[PDB]
Structures are given as C-alpha cells and as structure tokens.
C-alpha cells in the first residue's frame, strides 16, 4: 500500500502484490507496518520510478522480489537490499537502469535462489565484484533478453554460481576469459542468441551443460581437453558433434558423458561434402564433363554461321545455366578437395564469408534460369504451331529477347533474395539454400516449390497442346516442327527427371522428415541434382541439327576432319 506516494501500509502482509496505487518513493528504512513479509512484487507500481536505498529494513523472511514494468526507473541506488536471509528469488524486469545495481549489500543463505535480469535495454556491462558477498550456497543467474553489450573480467567473488543464462542477449559482443576467476561453477551455461565470439577460458572449464542455439557467432569452441565433463551441449553449428563424441577415460586408459545437439544426421558430415568410399571422384568427373559440354555448346553457338533463332536462344540460355551449375559444382568439389577427409573442424571458414553464399546464389540462379528456359521453350511451341492459322501474328525475335531478359532478371532477383537475409545458404554442407529455421525462409521455400510445380504443369500442358495440334489442328511441317518438339521434349525430360525428385528430397530434408532414409537422401541432391547440367548438353549435341552441322563443319575445316 502506498500513501502520499510513499509506503503507508497499516496491516502486516506477507504475499501482498504491489498493484496500481499512489507510490512515488520508498522511504529509507521506514518499512514499518509489516511484521512478517514473504514477497513484495512491484509490477503495476511503475509510478514509483525512484526508490530510496535501504527500503527493506527487517525483511528477514522475504522470499521473492520481482520488479517489472518499472521502465521509468532511471537508475538503482546502492544498497537496495539490507537484511533478507531467507531470500529465494530476485528479478528486475523492464527497468531502464543505465548502470548495473549494486546488490552486494544483500545478505542471504539459500541454494534455490535465482537472480534474473530481463527486458533491460539500458544496462551496459556487469561491473567486477557485482555479486560480492551476496549469497553463501548457490546463485542462478539469468540475463534473458538483456541490453548488456560486454562483460568485465573477474566479475564474481564470494559466491557460488550454480548455472548461468544469457539468452536473447544480442547486444552482447564478447566476455573476458577470466570473468569467473574467483567463482564456483557454473554447472550449466547459456549463450543462445548472445553473439559471443568465443567462450571464456576460465570459469567455463567446469561447465557440464551448454546452450548456444542461434548464436550465429560461436565459430570457435573450447578444446575437448579443457571440457572433460560436458554432459550436454546445444550448439547451432552441427559440426562439433564428431569432435566432441569422445567417451571419458574412466578406466583402462581407453561412460559416454559427452553429448551434442543436433545429432550427426549426415546433413553436415565430418567427412567431405561428397567424400565417400568410391563416390568422391564421381562429383569431379561429372563437373568436368558438364564444364566440357557447356564450353563446347557455347563455342558452337558463338561460332554458328546461322542467326540465333528463338530455339537457338533457348538452347544458349540452357547452355549458360548448365555452365553456371557446372562451375558451382566444380567450386564445391574444389572446396571439398584437399580436405583429406578431415573437414569437420573446417566448416567455420567454409560457410563464413562470401564463398558458400556465392555458391548458393549461383545454384539458385542456375535453377531459376533453367526453369525459365524450359517454360519459354514450352510456350514458344504453343503459338507457332497451335496458332498456325494466325501465323501472320507470330512473335518476333525482339519479344523473345525481352522474355529472356525478364527471365534473367527474375533469376537474379531469386539468387539475391537470400543474399539480403531472406534465406540462409549456410545450413547445408554443400552450402545451398535449404534452411527452414525462419518463417520468412519457410515462406520463400514454399513459394519456390509452388512456382516450380506451376512451371512444370505449364510445360506439360504446353507440350500436350503442341502434340495435339502438331498435325491435326491446321497443318504439319515435318522437319522443323519435329526437331523442335524432340529438342523440347528431351530438355523437359532431362530437367524434370533431375529436378523434381531432387526438389522433393530437398523439401523433405528442410522439413526434417525422413521419407525413406537419411543416408542417401542427400546423395541425390549432391549427385543426381546437378546431372542435368551435363545431361542437357549431351542431348544438345545429338538432337540439334544446326549444332551438329556446325561441329562437323568446324571439324572438317579446322584440320580435325
């Protein structure tokens, strides 16, 4: 109760909660009127922005303290708590204290006591010896969503810390190694969403459990020699599981107390990206074959005497997409190359930087370009053959060029979408955009899948219409129409048989649903997914009359034949 904007209660109360009442200052040591006190929580008492020191005089039996929604509190004076041996809970929420309060004047002896600071965006750092002479048995520290930016070395003395928590501490940058020089424990620590560069060398050596989910900055972890009792761990990088999967040497000089999360589901294995017993060289062979085929197709297209028609433009776009996919595969193989199978403590330098981001952007751009090229090829036959009776209204090369430019722009936008931050390409070993950890990323993945399904359905409908109207509707020209239909069907089949199962497997992996198995689920995405880069050019060198004629002419003229 607050009278004249000050404490004026007249009846002894223990579990009284501070509700909306007239209060602006807590008198110093004038807390009379209450003989036995259990908990005094000020949540709807934000009018009392400033409280004088030594407000609690003889609150020996006080159990819980919770100040919430007191944003108007500019700062907390030293010696807020004086006598409270039976203290069991303390929490400060939403307070706008620019300086860390001096809680060293509180004397208590309890083991279940927990001190939590939350919703505070004004605290800069925890000063040294902040909790000096506060408790004698155990303290549980929580900093859920605090505004602290750094920590001070040796910021603990005269007390034992059972566990620590720093969840949602995005403003925090780093903490000194010797931050717990004179501290005990902690048994468990939390660094989730803390943006900590590295764990402290001292104080954390006795940590049994750790939490670093969504840290996004824990590229370095302590050596396994220092952490000899890590009972559990939750690291957002699924690469330390293999290095930390060591049982303790309890007896016989070599019990599996060590643990990691997430488990090694083979999505980011300790070995190379594609390194298997015999499938390591398959990726390299496929990449070389695709690169050679794309180079040959590009050379034939550039050196072709005839003008680049709309089917020729579509073939050139498909060859460019295949070349981009082959270059991405070659870069991935080179990254996997020379690792010698020890690529477990190496992904930190792999995903971080512009490497995997560029690889994922290139892969997305190649996929979008291939999809748009297939759609354009399907749509071209829907008007030239079906609408032959209106052949005078046939589209010109300018329209095809504009369509190709629009498709390239759409592919570039799709590739740049995860670069801004919509999706993360660092969630896979192959460094591809298969992250569903965010609502925006899931929405983008669903939209991409829907667009791919719509494009496939449109291509199938256009092919069916072309086949139905090839000769029945108006007329049929055997040579040109047959060649165009054969090339379009070959390209559509090569794209579908290499993308649709791959897309379904990638969607299942992102959804974390094992459809058949988790071992070979990524095998198709690693090997079967990019084969369309090489399969398409191979069909392009045996089903294109102009390309094969140009190749034969070059071979005969330029000394080859």
DSSP-assigned letters across all residues of 279-301: -HHHHHHHHHHHHHHHHHHHHHH
CB 26 within 8 A of CB 3: no
Q: Take residue 371 and report the two structure tokens written for it.
A: 């999809």
Q: Say how far apart CA 546 and CA 532 lie, in whole Å.
A: 22
Q: Of the candidates 369, 279, 372, which has an alpha carbon nearest to the alpha carbon of residue 323?
A: 369
- What's the burial of 328, exposed, middle or buried (CB within 10 Å: 0-12/13-18/19+)? buried
Q: Per residue, what are the HEC states of 543-558?
A: CCHHHHHHHHHHHHHC
Helix, strand, coil percent values for the chain (each to nearest 5): 40, 10, 50
61 alpha carbon, distance to own chain's centre = 47
Cis before 262 (ω within 30)? yes
CB 202 within 8 A of CB 226: no
Alpha helices in 304-354 (DSSP H): 310-336, 347-351
Q: Say how far apart CA 232 and CA 255 lie, in whole Å.
A: 13
Q: Which residue has the tokens 């494009």?
A: 455
The 3-state DSSP class for residue 483 equals helix
Q: Say how far apart CA 460 and CA 495 lie, in whole Å.
A: 12
Q: Per residue, what are the HEC states of 120-180?
A: CCCCCEECCCCCCCCECCCEEEECCCCCCCEECCCCCCCCEEEEEECCCCCCCCECCCCCC
**Complete DSSP assignment for 237-258:** STTSHHHH------STT-----
Radius of gyration of the chain (CA): 34
| C-alpha distances in Å from residue 483, one per residue of 276, 385, 476, 489 | 41, 13, 12, 10
Spell out where 31-131 has E strands. Answer: 64-67, 89-93, 114-118, 125-126
Q: Say how far apart CA 234 and CA 191 lie, in whole Å.
A: 10
- Contacts of 371 by beta carbon, 8 Å cutoff, 6+ apart: 451, 452, 455, 495
Q: Say how far apart CA 402 and CA 372 lie, in whole Å.
A: 13
Residues in the chain, how many?
561
Q: Take residue 315 and report the two structure tokens written for it.
A: 């073939």
- Contacts of 10 by beta carbon, 8 Å cutoff, 6+ apart: 1, 33
Q: Take residue 257 and report the two structure tokens written for it.
A: 């107390």
Give residues after which the chain gaps, C-N over 2.5 angstroms.
Answer: 254
Q: Take residue 203 and report the two structure tokens written for it.
A: 């104080």
- Give the resolution value in Å: 3.8
| C-alpha distances in Å from residue 439, one per residue of 46, 223, 234, 444 | 35, 35, 21, 9
| C-alpha distances in Å from residue 35, one per residue of 3, 67, 89, 546 | 18, 21, 20, 101
Q: Say how far apart CA 242 and CA 271 lie, in whole Å.
A: 10
Cis before 240 (ω within 30)? no
Return the bridge partners of 67, or none: 42, 92
Q: Take residue 302 and report the two structure tokens written for it.
A: 């550039």
CB 475 within 8 A of CB 395: no
Q: Take residue 51 and report the two structure tokens written for it.
A: 């409280």
Return the bridge partners of 108, or none: 135
Q: Of the candidates 473, 283, 471, 453, which has an alpha carbon nearest to the alpha carbon of residue 371?
A: 453
Q: Say how far apart CA 516 and CA 248 lie, in whole Å.
A: 35
Q: Say how far apart CA 509 and CA 449 lie, in whole Å.
A: 14
Q: Of the candidates 62, 188, 68, which has an alpha carbon nearest to the alpha carbon of residue 119?
A: 68
Q: Take residue 366 and report the two structure tokens written for it.
A: 């190649």
Q: Take residue 184 and report the two structure tokens written for it.
A: 């005990």
Q: Say how far apart CA 523 and CA 275 lie, in whole Å.
A: 11
Handedness of CA 310, 311, 316, 322 (dihedral sign): positive
- What's the burial of 4, exposed, middle or buried (CB within 10 Å: 0-12/13-18/19+)? exposed
372 alpha carbon, distance to own chain's centre = 28
The 3-state DSSP class for residue 425 equals coil
Supply the angle between the helices 310-336 and 531-540 in degrees, to the nearest 10.
Answer: 140
Q: Say how far apart CA 101 and CA 297 lie, in whole Å.
A: 71
What is the maximal distance between C-alpha atoms in the chain? 111
């Amino acid at each position: 109760d607050g009278a004249l904007r000050c404490p004026g209660p007249t009846a002894g109360l223990t579990r009284l909660s501070l509700a909306y009442l007239p209060v602006k200052v807590i008198p110093s040591q004038a807390f009379r009127g209450l003989n036995e006190v259990i908990k005094i929580e000020i949540s709807q008492i934000d009018s009392l922005e400033r409280i004088e020191a030594n407000a609690f005089d003889n609150l020996l039996n006080l159990s819980e303290i919770l100040i919430q929604n007191t944003k108007n509190l500019r700062y907390i004076e030293p010696g807020a708590f004086i006598n409270l041996p039976r203290l069991k809970y303390l929490s400060i929420c939403n307070t706008g204290i620019r300086k860390f309060p001096d809680v060293t004047k509180v004397f208590s002896s309890e083991s279940n006591f927990i001190l939590e600071i939350c919703d505070n965006l004004h605290i800069t750092t925890i000063p040294g010896n902040a909790f000096q002479g506060m408790n004698n048995e155990s303290v549980t520290l929580k900093l859920y969503g605090n505004g602290f930016e750094e920590v001070q070395s040796h910021a603990f003395n005269g007390t034992t810390l059972t566990s620590l928590e720093l969840k949602e501490n995005v403003h925090l940058e780093k903490m000194h190694n010797g931050a717990f020089r004179g501290a005990t424990g902690p048994k468990t620590l939390d660094i989730s969403s803390t943006k900590l560069q590295a764990l402290p060398s001292y104080g954390l050596e006795s940590i049994q459990r750790l939490i670093a989910t969504s840290s996004y900055s824990l590229k370095k972890l302590p050596s396994r020699e220092t952490f000899v009792n890590l009972l559990e761990a939750t690291l957002t990088y699924p690469s330390h599981c293999c290095a930390f999967r060591n049982l303790p040497t309890k007896e016989q000089n070599f019990p599996k107390t060590p643990r990691c999360a997430p488990e090694p589901d083979a999505f980011n294995p300790c070995e190379d990206i594609m390194g298997y017993d015999f499938l390591r060289v398959l990726i390299w062979l496929i990449n070389i074959l695709a690169i050679m085929g794309n180079m040959t197709v590009l050379f034939v297209l550039l050196t072709s005497r005839y003008k680049l028609t709309v089917p020729r433009f579509l073939m050139c776009n498909l060859s460019f997409a295949d070349f981009c996919m082959g270059l991405y595969l070659l870069l991935i193989a080179s990254v996997d190359s020379q690792t010698k199978g020890q690529y477990y403590n190496h992904a930190i330098d792999w995903q971080t930087g512009s490497g995997c981001s560029t690889a994922g952007f290139f892969t997305v751009f190649a996929s979008e370009l291939s999809v748009y090229t297939l759609t354009v090829i399907t749509l071209e036959r829907w008007h030239t053959i079906t609408y032959a009776i209106h052949l005078d209204q046939k589209l010109r090369l300018r329209h095809a060029i504009l369509i190709m430019l629009g498709g390239w722009l759409f592919s570039s936008l799709i590739a740049m979408l995860p670069l801004v931050g919509v999706s993360n390409y660092m969630k896979v070993s192959i460094c591809f955009p298969m992250d569903v950890e965010t609502t925006l990323s899931q929405v983008y993945i669903l939209t991409i899948l829907i667009l791919n399904v719509v494009a496939f359905f449109i291509i199938c409908a256009c092919y069916i219409k072309i086949y139905f109207a090839v000769r029945n509707p108006e007329l049929m020209a055997t040579n040109k129409d047959t060649k165009i239909a054969k090339k379009m069907a070959i390209l559509i089949f090569t794209d579908f048989t290499c993308m649709a199962p791959i897309s379904f497997f990638a969607i299942s992996a992102a959804f974390k649903v094992p459809l058949i198995t988790v071992t070979n689920s990524k095998v198709l995405l690693v090997l079967f997914y990019p084969i369309n880069s090489c399969a398409n050019p191979f069909l392009y060198a045996i089903f294109t009359k102009t390309f094969q004629r140009d190749f034969f002419l070059l071979l005969s003229k330029f000394g080859c034949c």
